[PDB]
Motif scaffolding. Structure first.
Motif, mmCIF file in Angstrom:
data_model
loop_
_atom_site.group_PDB
_atom_site.id
_atom_site.type_symbol
_atom_site.label_atom_id
_atom_site.label_comp_id
_atom_site.label_asym_id
_atom_site.label_seq_id
_atom_site.Cartn_x
_atom_site.Cartn_y
_atom_site.Cartn_z
ATOM 1 N N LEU A 39 0.822 -1.199 0.000
ATOM 2 C CA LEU A 39 0.000 0.000 0.000
ATOM 3 C C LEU A 39 0.857 1.251 0.000
ATOM 4 C CD1 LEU A 39 -2.726 -0.824 2.605
ATOM 5 C CD2 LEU A 39 -2.898 -0.847 0.137
ATOM 6 N N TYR A 40 0.417 2.247 -0.757
ATOM 7 C CA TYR A 40 0.832 3.617 -0.533
ATOM 8 C C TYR A 40 0.041 4.165 0.633
ATOM 9 C CZ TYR A 40 2.870 3.465 -5.156
ATOM 10 O OH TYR A 40 3.613 3.141 -6.255
ATOM 11 N N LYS A 41 0.672 4.996 1.447
ATOM 12 C CA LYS A 41 -0.041 5.589 2.563
ATOM 13 C C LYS A 41 0.382 7.031 2.753
ATOM 14 C CE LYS A 41 -0.998 1.326 4.967
ATOM 15 N NZ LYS A 41 -0.811 0.448 6.141
ATOM 16 N N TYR A 60 4.180 10.705 1.530
ATOM 17 C CA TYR A 60 3.683 9.359 1.301
ATOM 18 C C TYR A 60 4.778 8.333 1.537
ATOM 19 C CZ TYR A 60 -0.240 11.651 -0.856
ATOM 20 O OH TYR A 60 -1.349 12.422 -1.083
ATOM 21 N N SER A 61 4.368 7.163 2.018
ATOM 22 C CA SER A 61 5.255 6.027 2.230
ATOM 23 C C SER A 61 4.836 4.911 1.288
ATOM 24 C CB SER A 61 5.199 5.562 3.676
ATOM 25 O OG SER A 61 3.917 5.070 3.988
ATOM 26 N N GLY A 161 9.996 6.450 0.690
ATOM 27 C CA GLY A 161 8.921 7.383 0.943
ATOM 28 C C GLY A 161 9.394 8.759 0.541
ATOM 29 N N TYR A 162 8.459 9.697 0.469
ATOM 30 C CA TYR A 162 8.853 11.047 0.115
ATOM 31 C C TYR A 162 7.936 12.046 0.787
ATOM 32 C CZ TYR A 162 5.155 10.737 -3.400
ATOM 33 O OH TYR A 162 3.966 10.559 -4.053
ATOM 34 N N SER A 176 2.382 17.092 -4.763
ATOM 35 C CA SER A 176 2.391 16.031 -5.753
ATOM 36 C C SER A 176 2.231 14.683 -5.084
ATOM 37 C CB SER A 176 3.684 16.043 -6.556
ATOM 38 O OG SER A 176 3.775 17.209 -7.342
ATOM 39 N N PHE A 177 1.537 13.784 -5.764
ATOM 40 C CA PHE A 177 1.464 12.386 -5.385
ATOM 41 C C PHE A 177 1.960 11.549 -6.545
ATOM 42 C CE2 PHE A 177 -0.958 8.465 -5.817
ATOM 43 C CZ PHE A 177 -0.498 7.791 -4.727
ATOM 44 N N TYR A 178 2.916 10.671 -6.269
ATOM 45 C CA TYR A 178 3.534 9.826 -7.276
ATOM 46 C C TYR A 178 3.172 8.374 -7.024
ATOM 47 C CZ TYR A 178 6.418 13.774 -8.511
ATOM 48 O OH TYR A 178 6.866 14.998 -8.932
ATOM 49 N N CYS A 179 2.766 7.682 -8.076
ATOM 50 C CA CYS A 179 2.482 6.256 -8.030
ATOM 51 C C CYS A 179 3.615 5.551 -8.760
ATOM 52 C CB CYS A 179 1.131 5.955 -8.670
ATOM 53 S SG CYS A 179 0.626 4.233 -8.634
ATOM 54 N N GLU A 181 4.102 2.497 -9.502
ATOM 55 C CA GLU A 181 3.736 1.497 -10.491
ATOM 56 C C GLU A 181 3.409 2.110 -11.830
ATOM 57 O OE1 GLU A 181 2.461 1.695 -7.582
ATOM 58 O OE2 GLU A 181 2.914 -0.171 -6.513
ATOM 59 N N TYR A 182 3.375 3.425 -11.920
ATOM 60 C CA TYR A 182 3.026 4.092 -13.155
ATOM 61 C C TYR A 182 4.233 4.272 -14.064
ATOM 62 C CZ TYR A 182 1.142 7.790 -16.142
ATOM 63 O OH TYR A 182 0.761 8.561 -17.209
ATOM 64 N N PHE A 183 5.390 3.774 -13.671
ATOM 65 C CA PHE A 183 6.551 3.727 -14.544
ATOM 66 C C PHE A 183 6.668 2.368 -15.203
ATOM 67 C CE2 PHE A 183 8.922 6.726 -11.499
ATOM 68 C CZ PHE A 183 7.888 7.600 -11.587
#
Lengths: 520, 208, 520
Positions: A39-41, A60-61, A161-162, A176-179, A181-183
Motif C-alpha cells: 500500500l501507498y499511505k 507518502y510512504s 517514501g517522500y 504532488s502524489f507519485y504512483c 507502479e506508473y513507470f
C-alpha cells in the motif's frame, strides 16, 4: 539459457589499481520485505500533537524499497582507502555498473506457533531505475540502509517514501502524489538478472590534501613590500598627542599589516562547545543557542553547515555545536547517547584557507570618525562571499556520503554539497524494487473491492556495484616526509577495522581524505 | 513551475540518518543540572535537526506592510522605514529587490514594502492612487527554496560561551551568497519586462 | 526460451504524448477464481416470486471470467486526463494491444481449520478472444469489474454470464444457449504468455469543448433582417380591436422573432428533482413519476436518456430524475445510499445546442382558429428528430464507459451510445478466461457420471493494455483565456486523486471532457 537451476551471476568484490584508474567492485546479499502490505499511505505530522511547528511534514510512504550505495565504505576497504588517501591528491568517479542477480523469492506462513518458509518459483519482483529524474530524489540525505561496510553482512533494503509541500499537517494544492507502479519496470523471476550502466558527468576532483601554507602567509619573509600602510595616526612620544598621519612599509616585522591579494572563505558562525564539561555553560543551549536558518516560518538547524575550521591552534577541546560531522561507534543508541559513543570528525586541514567555525570572520568599522567621536569597530559574524575570496570544501570520509543531487533551480553558488561529496546535476539514478503482490484466494462470488488478503512473502538475492575512479597522482618536490594514515603500532585487544570475538564488525574512527600537502 | 518539495524537506520521512547532532547539553530530569553532552540521530520525529546538503537563497530584508489598515503602524514609514542602498551619497530605494517569498503560510495580508511588483489597474492615477487601484503580484511559489522577504534569514551565535556567560544568538537580516546555496529567480508576468541589458562590467553575480 | 523460472513480460504503465498521438499503456495484477465449480447454470427470475414483471429474466452463468478495460480511468491518470481535456478538442482511439503474462496457478486446500496454498506448476488456464462477435457481447453495460483506476490495486476478474429471450421465468424457442468451451482457446501454463492486437474502425472524434454561441443567437447583433414576421394581428391603441395583419422586420430589439436556419436537438422529457429537500414533493415518485419506455410489456426506466441539458441558467439545484450519470464516492453503499455519497454529473456545456432535460421542447398549435374560436397552443414534451436539427452527444467522463457495441440491426439513428462513448460496430473483442478444471482422484472402479470433485484452485498474473489515441489539436483565435480544469489551490486534509492515510485511493469528483470552446 537461464533457469531455476543455473545461477544468474558471480560474486565480485575486488579493487583494480591501474595507473590513474582504480576500479572498485563490491557485492552484498540483501532481503527485501513487503512494506505497508502493498500500500501507498499518506503520512503526516502536525503541530496539533506534541510536535512543534518545525517538525511538521506531509508525504507518502510507498511499498517500494530502494538500493543506496551512496557511502564511501560501501565501495572501499580500509586498506584500499589507505592506498587512495596516502598516495593521491584527488579522485572523482567516472562510471558505474550495477547488477541484481540470484533472486530467491520465498513465501512464509504461520500455523499456530510454528513458522515455515518455502520457495515460490513463479513469483517475481519489479525493478526500475529512475533515469529521467522524475521522482523525489531521496538519496543524499545520509539515511541509513546503505550496503554494509563489510562484505559478509546481509542488509535489509530500506523503505521508499517522500515528503511534499505542506501547511501544518495538511497538504496544499501544489502537493504532488507519485504512483511508482506508473513507470515501466522490469519484472524478474528467479532465473532473471538485472543490469544497468551509468556515466558520471564531469566533476572537479575532490581535493584531498592540506595546504602547506596559510592564506595570509603567502609572502616572502625576506623582502619588504614597496606598498605603504597607515601605521600611526598620532604624534608618538611627544608631550602632545597632535594627530599626524605617518606611513610605513610592512615587512618581516609586521606581516599582519601587509597587503594581500586574497581573502578567506565565507563565514557563518557556530556556537562553541567544549568537550570538557566544566567549561561549558550550565543550561541546555543545544537547540536554543544553536545556529539556525528560518525558511517559511520553520527554523531549521544548520547542519553540518558551511565548511569552516573546527578549532584554532592548540585547542582541540572546542568544537562547533552543529558544525562537525558526527559518526556513532559500532552499537550506539539512536537517542541521547553519551559523548563517548559518537566519533566527532574535525577539519584541521582547512584552517589555512578557511576561518574557524566558532569565531568571528573579522572586524569592520561601525561609524564615521570625528575629532569628537571615537572610531568604533563591529564584529562580522556572518559573511557572504566577496570577490577575491578562496576556500576549501568540506572533506569526504570513509563513512560519509559520496555525492548529492544539485537541486534543479535557477541559480546556485558553488554547487558542492555541504555534507561533503560530489554535487551532481544528474546523479546516479535511484533504483527501486518491490515484491510483486500475490493474492490470497479470492472469494468464489465476484466482489468490487480490491483484494485485501495477500501471501506473506519476501525475496533475497545478490547485488553488485562497480565504480571506476579517476585519480590525480601526487607530484611534489617536498623534501621532508609527508603525514600518512597509519594504524596503531602498539598492541591491542583486537584489530581495528576487523571483527571482534562475536563477529561484530566495527570501524574505530572516522578517516578523512586529506593527509597529503600542497602549496596554497 | 513551482517546486513540489521544500528545500528543508528533501529527506526520506521513513528512515533515520546515520549522522548525529548535539541534542542535549544538560543533565535531564535529575536533581542537578550538571552539563553533559548527549547526542542523537535525527529522524521523522525531529526533522528540523537533520543535516542537509544545501541552504536557502540569499536574504536582504524588507519592511512588512499589511493590507489591513488597522494592523499597520500609524505614521508614514513608506520612505523612512524603507530598505535602501547607499551609492555615492544618494539613498536609492531597493525595488523590487532580490527574489524573496512574499509572505509565509496562511498570511496573505502582509507584503514587503518595496518587494513586490505592483501593476496598476486600467485607468489608474499616477500619484497617490489608492490601494484598490494597484495590482500587487505575489511570489508564493518560491517559498520552498527562497526565504520570506519580511523575515530574517536565520540566527547565528554572537559570542563564545563560558560557564559564566550564557550563549547569545543574533539575527541575520541581510545575508550574501554562501557556497551550497540555491534560489529561484523572480517570476515573469504577462505585463512585465521581457529582458534587460547586463551592464558591461568587470564582474557580476548571477546576472539575472 | 520461456520456463517456470523466467518471467513472461515486463511491467508497463506510461503515457507517450507525441504530436497528435497519445499512447497510454497500463498494467494490473488480477486473480481469477473458480466460478460455479466449473459449471454452466441456468439462472432466471420470475414474477411468481416477489419480483415484478419488469425484473424477470432468463439466462446462463458460465464458469468463465472476462477482462473489462472499458472505463477511461483504467487508461488515464488524472494528470494525463488533464493534459487531454485542457489542450485538445477531440480524441478517438486508433488501435490497442493486449497482453497476459506471468501466470501463477495456485492450489489451496483445507485441513481442519488451517489453510495452505501452493503452486501447481503443471496447471493451465484457457484464454480466447471472441473476434467474430459470435457471443452475447456483455461489455458496455457499465458493470463493475474493470481494471482499477489506480495501478497499485489488485482486482478480481468478474464472472461471465448472459441473458436470453424469456417469457416470465420460462424460456422461449428462440432462446440460445452458448457453451464457451466450444470455441478454440489457447491454454497457457506458467511459462506461457498471451497477446493480441486490435484496430479500431473509423469513428468521429469525441467532441470535447463547449460552444461559445447559443444556437438561437447565431445572428449579427448589429444588422436587421430583410425578412418579415407577423408581429401584430390586432389594431393597436384604437377604440376598437379590429383585426389587422401587421408585419415587421426582426432585429436587435426582438431576436426571439428572427428566422433561423436550424433547430435544437430532440427532446424526451424527464422529471425534475431538486437537491433541496423542502422543494420536492412529499411522496415517493422515483419509480412512479419516472420517464419509462414500454417494450414487450416491460416498463424500462430510461437511463441516462438522450443527451439534454441538465438544468437552465442559475438553477443548479434541479436535475432530471433519470437524466444525469451518477457516480458513487469511494466506499459507498450499493442500496439506498444517501445523496452525499453519490457524485452527480451535469451537462452545462450543451445548453447551447440541446434543450433542458426537465422542460418542454416547445409549443405548437392545437387547433385551427376562427373568429369564434380562440387559438390554442399545446406543449411538445417528446420530440423526435426533424430536418434541420442539430445536437451534441453526451460527454465522456474519466470514470465512465469508453465505447459500446452498436447492435447489429437493420437500421439505427445516430448510433452513438446514450451513456456516452464511442459506438462501434466491431468493438474490441471481449476476452474470456477460465481455470482449466483439475479433477480430484477418481474412484478405482469405472463410473459413467461426470467427475464432481475438483481441486480448489485459482490463478493470478499480470495484464497489460495499450491504446493508441488520435488527438484533434485545438486551434483557436479566441483572445481571452479559456476555462481549464484546475485542482483546488486551497489547503486540504489530503490530496485529491491520491491515497488517504489507510491506503484507500479515491476520486473526489467526476471530470468531464469539455472545457475548451468553439464557435457553434
Amino acid at each position: 539459457a537461464d533457469g531455476v537451476g543455473s545461477s544468474s551471476g558471480n560474486w565480485h568484490c575486488d579493487s583494480t589499481w591501474l595507473g590513474d584508474r582504480v576500479i572498485t567492485t563490491s557485492t552484498r546479499t540483501w532481503a527485501l520485505p513487503t512494506y505497508n502490505n502493498h500500500l501507498y499511505k499518506q503520512i503526516s505530522n502536525g503541530t496539533s500533537g506534541g510536535s512543534t511547528n518545525d517538525n511538521t511534514y506531509f508525504g507518502y510512504s510507498t511499498p517500494w524499497g530502494y538500493f543506496d550505495f551512496n557511502r564511501f565504505h560501501c565501495h572501499f576497504s580500509p586498506r584500499d582507502w589507505q592506498r587512495l588517501i596516502n598516495n593521491n591528491w584527488g579522485f572523482r568517479p567516472k562510471r558505474l555498473n550495477f547488477k541484481l542477480f540470484n533472486i530467491q523469492v520465498k513465501e512464509v506462513t504461520q500455523n499456530e506457533g510454528t513458522k515455515t518458509i518455502a520457495n515460490n518459483l513463479t513469483s517475481t519482483i519489479q525493478v526500475f531505475t529512475d533515469s529521467e529524474y522524475q521522482l523525489p530524489y531521496v538519496l543524499g540525505s545520509a539515511h541509513q540502509g546503505c550496503l554494509p561496510p563489510f562484505p559478509a553482512d546481509v542488509f535489509m533494503i530500506p523503505q521508499y517514501g517522500y515528503l511534499t509541500l505542506n501547511n501544518g499537517s495538511q497538504a496544499v494544492g501544489r502537493s504532488s502524489f507519485y504512483c511508482l507502479e506508473y513507470f515501466p519496470s522490469q519484472m524478474l523471476r528467479t532465473g532473471n538478472n538485472f543490469e544497468f550502466s551509468y556515466q558520471f558527468e564531469d566533476v572537479p576532483f575532490h581535493s584531498s590534501y592540506a595546504h602547506s601554507q596559510s592564506l595570509d602567509r603567502l609572502m616572502n619573509p625576506l623582502i619588504d613590500q614597496y606598498l605603504y600602510y597607515l601605521s600611526r595616526t598620532q604624534s608618538t612620544g611627544g608631550t602632545a598627542g597632535t594627530q599626524q598621519l605617518l606611513f610605513s612599509q610592512a615587512g618581516p616585522n609586521n606581516m599582519s599589516a601587509q597587503a594581500k591579494n586574497w581573502l578567506p572563505g565565507p563565514c557563518y558562525r557556530q556556537q562553541r562547545v567544549s568537550t570538557t564539561l566544566s567549561q561549558n555553560n550550565n543550561s541546555n543551549f543545544a537547540w536554543t543557542g544553536a545556529t539556525k536558518y528560518h525558511l517559511n516560518g520553520r527554523d531549521s538547524l544548520v547542519n553540518p553547515g558551511v565548511a569552516m575550521a573546527t578549532h584554532k591552534d592548540d585547542e582541540e577541546r572546542f568544537f562547533p555545536s552543529s558544525g562537525v560531522l558526527m559518526f556513532g561507534k559500532q552499537g550506539a543508541g539512536k537517542d541521547n547517547v553519551d559523548y563517548s559513543s559518537v566519533m566527532l570528525t574535525s577539519e584541521e586541514e582547512i584552517k589555512t584557507t578557511n576561518p574557524v567555525a566558532t569565531e568571528q570572520y573579522g572586524v569592520v568599522a561601525d561609524n564615521l570618525q570625528q575629532q569628537n567621536a571615537a572610531p568604533i569597530v563591529g564584529a562580522v559574524n556572518s559573511q557572504g562571499a566577496l570577490p577575491g575570496m578562496v576556500w576549501q570544501n568540506r572533506d569526504v570520509y570513509l563513512q560519509g556520503p559520496i555525492w548529492a543531487k544539485i537541486p534543479h533551480t535557477d541559480g546556485n553558488f558553488h554547487p558542492s554539497p555541504l555534507m561533503g561529496g560530489f554535487g551532481l546535476k544528474h546523479p546516479p539514478p535511484q533504483i527501486l524494487i518491490k515484491n510483486t503482490p500475490v493474492p490470497a484466494d479470492p472469494p468464489t462470488t465476484f466482489s468490487q473491492a480490491k483484494l485485501a488478503s495477500f501471501i506473506t512473502q519476501y525475496s533475497t538475492g545478490q547485488v553488485s556495484v562497480e565504480i571506476e575512479w579517476e585519480l590525480q597522482k601526487e607530484n611534489s618536490k617536498r623534501w621532508n616526509p609527508e603525514i600518512q594514515y597509519t594504524s596503531n603500532y602498539y598492541k591491542s585487544t583486537n584489530v581495528d577495522f576487523a571483527v571482534n570475538t562475536d563477529g561484530t564488525y566495527s570501524e574505530p574512527r572516522p578517516i578523512g581524505t586529506r593527509y597529503l600537502t600542497r602549496n596554497l
